[PDB]
């Protein structure tokens, strides 16, 4: 499979500072394309990607309404969630959701997603069958009973299998120059002495898209997982990502180490070493 569409929603209450803020960001893989924020001076669904801009007036209004209505729905949910946990109306809380679909190279549904987390803990999720639910605790079971009764899963399923897959297919075609382009990482190894006894070899990966990558170090062909310091892949701000893996090595032994890079924008995986 090769692509995915996903909406990340965050609703957070703030007692005494107005109604809960709701923001929804939409993505195609690692490319954000829309945002909706109830805190914007004039909340509307707005482009964050060039290829979504061509969509007509009707597209923006329909989606602006969906997110305006989702704001009220999430606000009502947070109210209910406080009750399910016997929580005070003085505390601030967070309801997060992720929904979307994954499609294969032929654009066929690989799988749907619709899950929620309350205050950072998983709360409830639509199972892969797109028919049943998994609740985390007795509070989530209340949400499950209500959803089962209103036949909510059937509604999510039609969205995940129909509407979601179709918009993803449309988006992918409209932004084919970027969405369907993998940019390989530019790689190199640096070397920083630490003392007379050891030096750091840092393997770099820059300018790559999508974010997914694997950087590893091997000493004598052996993986150095326990000894490698790996940073979290970070956005450069130009749509690309960066990442590095470092290992402290004894002086004079640098040539026994090899950095291995795997990225989908590379035909065959790379093997690099420090070049004095």
């Amino acid at each position: 499979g090769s692509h995915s569409m996903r909406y990340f929603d965050t609703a957070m209450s703030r007692p005494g500072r107005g109604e809960p803020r709701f923001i929804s960001v939409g993505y195609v893989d690692d490319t954000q394309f829309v945002r909706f924020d109830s805190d914007a001076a004039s909340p509307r669904e707005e482009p964050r990607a060039p290829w979504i801009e061509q969509e007509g007036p009707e597209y923006w209004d329909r989606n602006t309404q969906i997110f305006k209505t989702n704001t009220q729905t999430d606000r009502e949910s947070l109210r209910n969630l406080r009750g399910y946990y016997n929580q005070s109306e003085a505390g601030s809380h967070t309801l997060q959701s992720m929904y979307g679909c994954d499609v294969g190279p032929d654009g066929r549904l690989l799988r749907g997603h619709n899950q929620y987390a309350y205050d950072g803990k998983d709360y409830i999720a639509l199972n892969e069958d797109l028919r049943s639910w998994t609740a985390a605790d007795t509070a989530a079971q209340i949400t499950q009973r209500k959803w089962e009764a209103a036949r909510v899963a059937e509604q999510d399923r039609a969205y995940l299998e129909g509407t979601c897959v179709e918009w993803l297919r449309r988006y992918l075609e409209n932004g084919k120059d970027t969405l369907e382009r993998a940019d390989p990482p530019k790689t190199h190894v640096t070397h920083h002495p630490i003392s007379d006894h050891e030096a750091t070899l840092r393997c770099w990966a820059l300018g790559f898209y999508p974010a997914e990558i694997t950087l590893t170090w091997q000493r004598d062909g052996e993986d150095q997982t326990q000894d490698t310091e790996l940073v979290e892949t970070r956005p450069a701000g130009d749509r690309t990502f960066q990442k590095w893996a470092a290992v402290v090595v004894p002086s004079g032994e640098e040539q026994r180490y090899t950095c291995h890079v795997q990225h989908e924008g590379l035909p065959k995986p790379l093997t690099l070493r420090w070049e004095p």
Binding site: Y7, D9, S24, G26, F36, E45, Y59, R62, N63, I66, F67, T69, N70, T73, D74, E76, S77, N80, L81, L95, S97, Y99, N114, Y116, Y123, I124, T143, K146, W147, A150, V152, Q155, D156, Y159, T163, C164, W167
Partner: peptide, 8 residues
């Protein structure tokens, strides 16, 4: 396109 959400 967004999805219609249901109250928890």
């Amino acid at each position: 396109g967004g999805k219609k959400k249901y109250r928890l």
